[PDB]
Amino acid sequence: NSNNLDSKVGGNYNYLYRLFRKSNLKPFERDISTEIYQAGSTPCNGVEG
Amino acid sequence: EVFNATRFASVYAWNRKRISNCVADYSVLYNSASFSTFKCYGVSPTKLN
User: Fold this and answer.
1) Which among B39, B43, B46, B48 has the fewest CB atoms less than 10 Å away?
2) Is some CB atom of chain B closer than 8 A to the CB atom of A40?
3) d(Cα B32, Cα B21) in Å, to the nearest integer?
4) Which residues 6-25 of chain B have a CB within 8 Å of chain A?
5) Which residues of B touch A40 (CB under 8 A)?
6) List of chain B residues whose C-beta atoms are within 8 Å of the C-beta of residue A42
7) Which contacts qualify for A36-39: CB closer than 8 Å, 24 or more apart?
């Protein structure tokens, strides 16, 4: 537990997690790309919405 | 037949319609862009199909 180490009044905005990815991962593999996921079939070309 | 309809019941007396014995295509509904709010709980919108 790290309640008194990281937890900051207001919350920690520096800790991120990947909720969306195009395909499943491989063991010991890291992904840092911030490309906008094409959730819909409509291509966004890097435009959020 | 139920959602093109022009009548929507009141919230406190809402209309419930059962759906069974057919094939459901959710992906085509999700791809179409005429709705302004979509969210799911317990399942992701891309997998219903």
Assistant:
1) B39
2) yes
3) 24
4) none
5) 30-31, 33
6) 31, 33
7) A39/B45, A39/B46
Quick one: CA dihedral B31, A34, A21, A13, positive or negative?
negative
Count of beta carbons in the 10 Å neighbourhood of residue B46 = 13
Phi/psi for B11 (5° steps) reads -65, -45
The reply to whether residue B30 touches residue A40, judged by beta carbons under 8 angstroms, is yes
> What is the three-class DSSP state of B13?
helix
Contact between A7 and A19 under an 8 Å Cβ cutoff? The reply is: no
Reported structure resolution in angstroms: 3.2
Experimental technique behind these coordinates: cryo-EM
